[PDB]
From Swiss-Prot:
Found in a mRNA decay complex with LSM1, LSM3, LSM4, EXOSC2, EXOSC4, EXOSC10, PARN, XRN1, CNOT6, UPF1, UPF2 and UPF3B. Forms a complex with DCP1A, EDC3, DDX6 and EDC4/HEDLS, within this complex directly interacts with EDC4/HEDLS. Interacts with DPC1B. Interacts (via N-terminus and C-terminus) with TRIM21 (via N-terminus and C-terminus). Associates with polysomes. Interacts with LIMD1, WTIP and AJUBA. Interacts with DDX17 in an RNA-dependent manner. Interacts with ZC3HAV1. Interacts with APOBEC3G in an RNA-dependent manner. Interacts with ZFP36L1 (via N-terminus). Interacts with NBDY. The chain holds residues 96 to 244 of 420 of the full protein. It comes from Homo sapiens. Keywords: Cytoplasm, Hydrolase, Manganese, Metal-binding, Nonsense-mediated mRNA decay, Nucleus, Phosphoprotein, RNA-binding. It is found in: Cytoplasm, P-body; Nucleus. One of its GO terms (biological process) is histone mRNA catabolic process. Mn(2+) binds at E49, E53. Its main location: cytoplasm. Residues 1-131 form the Nudix hydrolase domain. This is m7GpppN-mRNA hydrolase.
Amino acid sequence: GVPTYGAIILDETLENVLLVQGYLAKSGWGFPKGKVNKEEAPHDCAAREVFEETGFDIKDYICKDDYIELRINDQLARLYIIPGIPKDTKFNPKTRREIRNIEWFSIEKLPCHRNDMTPKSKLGLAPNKFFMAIPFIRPLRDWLSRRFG
Ligand SMILES: CC(C)C(=O)/N=c1/[nH]nc([C@@H]2CCCO2)s1
């Protein structure tokens, strides 16, 4: 699978994260990210995708060693951690044919797993609008505990 790159943007209090909502198969909330172009460096891909999806330029704030990376279904997604961005920043996608909405979310209120259906004696997981973000939540909380406190 082609690698994807993006960002986890936090505010100045470290208790809110910026998520974006797409359409159709990307109809829920997730971190801004996308697929790398041929010959494009990881940091340049992350900045390009975040600016296309949010209108905010991270290039002068990326730190090379500060990211969370996951391999899901043999595809690799790497999100650079960007703290300290003011909550009154004006965010605007480049293409609203791809992005429905942009919002801050409390990290402590976000889910870190989906719920089962054991009350119905049925296998699988119940739907949740944060499905694309959920895999990053626990590793982000653990990263923030080790780096800050
Ligand atoms: C109404 C809208 C915000 C919403 O929830 N969209 C979803 N689309 N995909 C979902 C399911 C559950 C997780 C796996 O796929 S949830």
